[PDB]
Amino acid sequence: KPSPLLVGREFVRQYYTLLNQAPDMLHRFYGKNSSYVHGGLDSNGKPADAVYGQKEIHRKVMSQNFTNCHTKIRHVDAHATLNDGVVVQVMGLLSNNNQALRRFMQTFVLAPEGSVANKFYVHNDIFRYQDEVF
Amino acid sequence: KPSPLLVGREFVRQYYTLLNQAPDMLHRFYGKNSSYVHGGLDSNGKPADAVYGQKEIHRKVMSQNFTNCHTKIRHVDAHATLNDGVVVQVMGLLSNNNQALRRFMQTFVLAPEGSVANKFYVHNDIFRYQDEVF
Amino acid sequence: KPSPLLVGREFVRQYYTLLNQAPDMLHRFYGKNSSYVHGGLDSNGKPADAVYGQKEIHRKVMSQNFTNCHTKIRHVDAHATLNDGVVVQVMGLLSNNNQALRRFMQTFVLAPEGSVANKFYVHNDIFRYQDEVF
Amino acid sequence: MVMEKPSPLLVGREFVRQYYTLLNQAPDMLHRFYGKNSSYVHGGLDSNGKPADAVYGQKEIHRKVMSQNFTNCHTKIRHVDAHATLNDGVVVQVMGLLSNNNQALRRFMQTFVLAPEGSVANKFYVHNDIFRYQDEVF
Amino acid sequence: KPSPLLVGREFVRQYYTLLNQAPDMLHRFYGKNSSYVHGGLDSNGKPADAVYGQKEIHRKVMSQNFTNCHTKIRHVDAHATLNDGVVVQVMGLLSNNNQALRRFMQTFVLAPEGSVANKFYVHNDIFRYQDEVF
Amino acid sequence: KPSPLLVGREFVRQYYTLLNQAPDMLHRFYGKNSSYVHGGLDSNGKPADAVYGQKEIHRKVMSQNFTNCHTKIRHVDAHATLNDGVVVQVMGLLSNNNQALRRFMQTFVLAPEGSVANKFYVHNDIFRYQDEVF
Amino acid sequence: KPSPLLVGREFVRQYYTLLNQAPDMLHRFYGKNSSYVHGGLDSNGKPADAVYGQKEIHRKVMSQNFTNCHTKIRHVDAHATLNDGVVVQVMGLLSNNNQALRRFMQTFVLAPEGSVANKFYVHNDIFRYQDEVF
Amino acid sequence: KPSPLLVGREFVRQYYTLLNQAPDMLHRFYGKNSSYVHGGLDSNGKPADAVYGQKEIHRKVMSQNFTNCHTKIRHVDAHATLNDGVVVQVMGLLSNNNQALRRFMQTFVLAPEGSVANKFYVHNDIFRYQDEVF
Amino acid sequence: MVMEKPSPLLVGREFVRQYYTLLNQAPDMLHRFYGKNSSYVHGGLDSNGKPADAVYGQKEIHRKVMSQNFTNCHTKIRHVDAHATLNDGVVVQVMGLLSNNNQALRRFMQTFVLAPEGSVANKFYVHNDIFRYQDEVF
Amino acid sequence: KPSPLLVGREFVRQYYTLLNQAPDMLHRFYGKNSSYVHGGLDSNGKPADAVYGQKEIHRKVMSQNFTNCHTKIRHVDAHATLNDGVVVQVMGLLSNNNQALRRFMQTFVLAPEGSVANKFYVHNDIFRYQDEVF
Amino acid sequence: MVMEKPSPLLVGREFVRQYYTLLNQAPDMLHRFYGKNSSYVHGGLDSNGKPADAVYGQKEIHRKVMSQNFTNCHTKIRHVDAHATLNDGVVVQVMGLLSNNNQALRRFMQTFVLAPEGSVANKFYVHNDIFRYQDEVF
Amino acid sequence: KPSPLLVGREFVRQYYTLLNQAPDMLHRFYGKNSSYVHGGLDSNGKPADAVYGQKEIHRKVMSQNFTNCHTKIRHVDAHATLNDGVVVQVMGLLSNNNQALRRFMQTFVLAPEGSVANKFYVHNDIFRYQDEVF
Amino acid sequence: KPSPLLVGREFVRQYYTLLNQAPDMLHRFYGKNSSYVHGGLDSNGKPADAVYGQKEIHRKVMSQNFTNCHTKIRHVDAHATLNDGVVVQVMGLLSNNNQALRRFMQTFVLAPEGSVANKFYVHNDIFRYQDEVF
Amino acid sequence: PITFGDFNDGEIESLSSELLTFGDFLPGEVDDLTDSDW
Amino acid sequence: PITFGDFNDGEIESLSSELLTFGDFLPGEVDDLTDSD
Amino acid sequence: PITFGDFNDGEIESLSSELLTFGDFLPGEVDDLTDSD
Amino acid sequence: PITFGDFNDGEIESLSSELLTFGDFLPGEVDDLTDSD
Amino acid sequence: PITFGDFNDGEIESLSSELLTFGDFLPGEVDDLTDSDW
Amino acid sequence: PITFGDFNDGEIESLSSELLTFGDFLPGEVDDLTDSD
């Protein structure tokens, strides 16, 4: 059984590498019933709701139009959870389209796939920009 | 079965009210082999390690010396997760001993007790300030 | 037509239940061109002009930072008023962020919305404490 | 020299001033502030330990303001907040202290709902009057 | 023949008195080919265009929702113009719905109606809030 | 007939370019019986007497002693008026002798010359600073 | 006799405390043929005139409709003047009815009563806001 | 030499008399390197940090506008302390600007000045309210 | 890795935590916090109606705290504010609620004056302890 | 299909005509996700922050306040970029607000609109005052 | 260790550095920067008093580079500004000074358009190169 | 008394030597009544506010942050003036922070300091970048 | 022997002038076995490893490729040290490629050359940005 | 007789010439009782 | 069916669950612990 | 002679006068109306 | 028909109106006076 | 063999492991000519 | 003896040293490389 801390660190490295190297394959990280929210607003001004399902996750990611996003990961904290899952808490800065970096707080929940050993998928993805709620 | 969002909101209300009123009773939220990460810097200016078990969580909470610790819950996200758990991300301001309000993020993973329905315990608690990361 | 007393009691119970539970959706009680004045918040803290509209009311309520806002309603007086509306004067104790009981007086003017029968919205919402004015 | 009609706050402040000055001077004339279907309650207690109910008519109101000696009453208004409401009317929230026949200064909470008379412009009457002492509630 | 300064001062006082008292009768000031713009923004950050004709002027005035507007006329400058017309330059403060006063710049162009002596109508009305363009 | 907006924007460009370059030639814009009100304070302080005719307008313009008058045209409105004339309201910033930019309003009424088509002269010019009114 | 500064400070304390508590008793500070101006705006917009005598001063003070008049005395200057009187200049902030604090200046001329020793009456009271002139 | 109880009572009397009478002269009670921490009041509002030195103490006292501060001393406890100094714990009711009686607790640490016998100065001055804490 | 000496605020917070935990658990051992010339009052009330007086030594403090019979005390510290004072000492201002013998929560007002022991560095003892319930003062 | 040189000359003529005549209409040249960079002062005058989108481009052009922006185009070089777009490098002299000629170099990347044939939009707009970097 | 493929500004800066270092050291090797259908002008001037035309193609782009006698070229870049463009391209704007064969510092204006190679990721080729001396234009 | 031309040439050499080498000691050239105007920067650099006194002049020089200022003095004209002072008008090229040669014109008024013979101080220092006004 | 402050000031001027003008010639300042630490985050935020020798220093400088670096030297301290060398601490602003100015500190240790008098070489150069460590 | 629009002479002034009154009191009646007291 | 704003009947009541307990606390234990004192 | 700071003995007592009256108010009358009610 | 942005053919040229004159200036007099020097 | 999603072992690394190069030069080839000079 | 401000005779000249060289540059190489180029 791998260390949850190293599992979370490796997952964060791979996820934020793929977020800019090829954002259109970010949906491959998620499973059949996975929650995803990436810190957006709307007309009412309230934070955007999450989406569920790989397809809706892919649609939302494509709508988010990530172009060469640079992320500075300032803190990663990974710990054990239900069904040998891993909960990851990420503090960092993300800048999209080479604009100003924005502080962000993120929570990942990765569950084992079940068949392939040492394999995980993103069950939950919660991303929020600090400047949108504070 | 109650809404994940309802469960998260009610838990956040109860937790951050009990933290202000009776910090010594905060250990009853957690169960066996539950993770508690709330802390600041280590002896070498590093984020602290996790604390496991109800007795040790109580010992750590008492160390944090929470004096009239209020709260300013700017945002709460609650999503259903594996094993019927609820993953809550709480972002806001916390002031302890009436000092300046410091921005904070906190990830809760609430597992469902198998005995009683509509019963949860904090399987994971990961608190982290901002001034200490950026 | 429902008795003015009955609609006042209904509204007071529902309004403070929502205030204690989910302050982030208090704006749904109000409609367009509805006025909401709540205490004071300024550089000096005493003058806070009233806000109008659901979106501005939601902004103001988000500023009020209601967290576990407990309320002990000592008295409610509901009377019939123009356009078959009701006027409610409620007196009680309020505690936000787990402070002590502060005596408060609120005046609501509720108006029917026309289409749906026995449906009201908060046209006017005036809040005051006894610490601000002797 | 614009002839701007008064703001709701100015209307409420002026009405509170006139109402309480009249109450101090001529309580019997106070009934002229109310209309046919006006509601009025002024800090009463029934033989139950509960707050009293309200009368719904200038006549019942006159009987109420008459029953209430209201003779030589000193009032100190600490807060007035007025806003616009349904049908051009004005809702006023009054916080103050009152004393009738020179007892102690009792804190009171009041809500006024004034409505335009209609036939005459810039004229209002007290449609609703809710008055409660803090002693009989808290 | 009356003094253009007197005509401008009387028109300004009458126009703002009528705007405060009965804004739904403001269209009676204007004529067949009158132009009316009252300083709005529309979906691009660019000032709103003017409207022409008495009916369109009335519709725009009603849409503008003038509720107990208070004005402080700080400067009026009236001068003669073609066909004995009057051009009026107005500097002032206007507050709608008893909110904060906003600095405004206005230009009126009044023309003789032709048959009745000393009778004028608003051929042109240009109104702009300073905070919307500066 | 050229568009009133085009006429106004072209006249504003020409006028505020000639004001900076050759203010001695500004009098050629006006004709006989033309009002010029550009001014500041006097013994009374608030009103400035208008000067009529090309000679008086040139004398007054030379009196203002324009020196590298820089202009920042924030907004310009041009509408048709009597006798196919154009009424222009110009709002912006003016800086004389490289001093601090001051907010200004200027109302132009351009009357068409009856001899040559596409020809206008400034029948009315009403300039007014803001800092001197508020 | 006491120090002019002592007299001025004591009078300022008593006056601005009685103004908050019992404004109806403020007329007892003045005697006959005593000047009292407290204004800034009227029907014509000119500074308010003066009311002389205890009766007229009381009538004016009552019109001002003082309601919980809070004060913040930034500075008080007290100097001896002719006939052993005291001239006080008071600069500070004044809020009526818990509204926004407005800067104010007030000149008091206190004349000694001939009969009683250590007794003064407000011979002159001149109040002026700042926002109403600048 | 003088009873610590006598010193504490004499201080309390003089200090609160001067607070009620001449707040601008409170800084004379303290010396250099002395500390003056009052109740929470600042731009943020809660974290009112301590200030040191006579001049900074005077600035803080002026900021905290003291106008007719009425104080009812319910209890005073004076005890001997290091360097033959005294410690005074005072409980009472304070009303500033004519608000209501607010429960307050103050802690003075007074040290002998050394040069003049029976002369003390406020080395430490900690003020606290009941409402802003309980 | 710096060996910084604790700030007065940290010293006061840590002392309050230790003091009240010991009072809850082992009140007999509470006397070890005080020195020879230590003054101590804890919410006293003589048979007159006035606050009690102070003991001025370790053994009298010991006897007194046994006299108060602290058994299973629950304390909720709402405010602690510590500052430096003469001779590197720390003055602590404490606001809280206390209950002895499972009684109601009583608001208490407390001032501590801790002084360095002198021999061992970073060691303090309670020179002054002033404690009063607000029920007996207000 | 059209010669890249012909497209470049056409665009340079139209763009620098519209810059001089109607600066507020420049945003129509660009489309979504297009980049405009033109000097500008974040605080020192050197920080050049790119803006994207028609609305942000409009705001940046308005902040520059182009007034009578004259330009003499010394050289234009047009070539064919990817996806059948064009690249234009223009060298010339620019004078805004009637100041002296300043050497400037601009680089446009124009992409075909796609639907309408022979239609282009400014995908990239990099402007540089040569004197700023030399 | 997020890989984080370089931003357009970094790509442009690195390309300018490499391009001008190669031009200084091995101008004959500079032709490898361009593709099959690359456009290239470098401060040309025909015998008409007008700027020279363009060259489209790698082989004769090399011939044009050879024709210009690039020997010991000293270049000082004073401004580089790069941005993203069509087909994940990079448009670079360069302000600088150049001297070939040790004449004076001639001030020059340049525009680069780089496009992905496609076969290999993170690989670019100079699709467009426009270079003009200011004296030959102004 | 020496030749005013010699005094001007000596002062110009010393001043533009000390400006190049040690800008932080430029304030020693001025007295207490000296005036120093140089450039200007409020929002875009247009308002040139003169500063008076050695300390304010040093603040201004330090704000400008002269770093390796190279000066080519094309011309110097020195003349005698009131109270046996000197007036120097210098024309040249200035480059600060290694920018290009910018044409500049400076006017110094030097006054004898009285006590020490043949000693002067810069009473007036008016600097102007020619390009910024032309 | 020159003053250490004089040596430090002259070296700072020459070094930063050469850095702006000809950064490729910066290697001539250093000798053999000289330390160069200028840099930022190498791979994981670690401090940049020092490069020793003229060849490595030149390679590292060319790697940083300062295209046009403008420096605002806020302060320079120069003190004597071992072997008559000079230690300089330079604090200021640095902006590469006309980007935003960033605060920086730089420690130079200049060692004298035993061959030629009044000759120094940069034995140590330690550059550090502020935003990268704070 | 200066008028604007189709408004008659003094129409706007009459439409706007009405003081603030409460109840059935004529304007200035309420204060009269207060003025009766010293 | 007296409802307010845009809330459907019973929406506010559905917004809360009295059967929801966390940890070892019995239902309402936290409310009793905090509201009382 | 217990004094505090740079206060001479009796300075604070001399800082105010208890027989200073304004208008027709008797001594202490203003305090009486404005102390508590 | 080469067009740019959303402008139609001739839309930008329609904003010039070079035959417009103001005052007694002949066409081109203002720009001739200003741009030359 | 720690993998996430359906990505194979090292697929993300392989995809994202490519240095920035220009023209046909191998990475680090261009600076070699500069290193040839002193 | 003509001086300005508060500087002595030749104080400014003493503030500048022409013999101060850094690295391999001859006394004036940096200035020659910077100006007139």
Residue numbers in the entry:
A (entry chain B), B (entry chain A), C (entry chain H), E (entry chain F), F (entry chain E), G (entry chain T), ...: 5 to 138
D (entry chain G), I (entry chain N), K (entry chain C): 1 to 138
N (entry chain K), R (entry chain I): 472 to 509
O (entry chain L), P (entry chain X), Q (entry chain J), S (entry chain V): 472 to 508
What do the study authors state?
The interaction between CHIKV nsP3 and host G3BP1 is critical for viral replication. G3BP1 plays a key role in the assembly and dynamics of host stress granules (SGs). Old World alphaviruses, including Semliki Forest virus (SFV) and CHIKV, have also evolved ways to prevent SG formation by viral nsP3 binding to G3BP1 (24, 39, 40). The NTF2L domain of G3BP1 has been verified to bind to various partners through the FGxF (Phe–Gly–x–Phe; x: Asp, Glu, or Ser) motif.
The CHIKV-43–NTF2L complex structure was subsequently determined using the single-particle cryo-EM method to a resolution of approximately 2.7 Å. Totally, three continuous yet distinguishable conformations (referred to as Conformations I, II, and III) of the CHIKV-43–NTF2L complex were identified, accounting for 49.1%, 32.9%, and 18.0% of the total particles, respectively. Conformation I represents an intermediate state between Conformations II and III. Since the overall folds and interaction surfaces of the three conformations are nearly identical, we used Conformation I, which has the highest proportion, to illustrate the details. The final model consists of eight CHIKV-43 peptides and eight NTF2L homodimers. The overall structure of the CHIKV-43–NTF2L complex consists of a double-ring architecture. Each ring contains four NTF2L dimers and four CHIKV-43 peptides, presented in a parallelogram shape. The two parallelograms displayed a rotation angle of approximately 50°. The CHIKV-43 peptide interacts with NTF2L at a molar ratio of 1:2, which is consistent with our ITC result. Four CHIKV-43 peptides can be divided into two groups based on two distinct conformations: chains L and J as well as chains K and I. Chain L (or J) interacting with two NTF2L protomers presents a compact conformation, while chain K (or I) binding to two NTF2Ls forms an extended conformation.
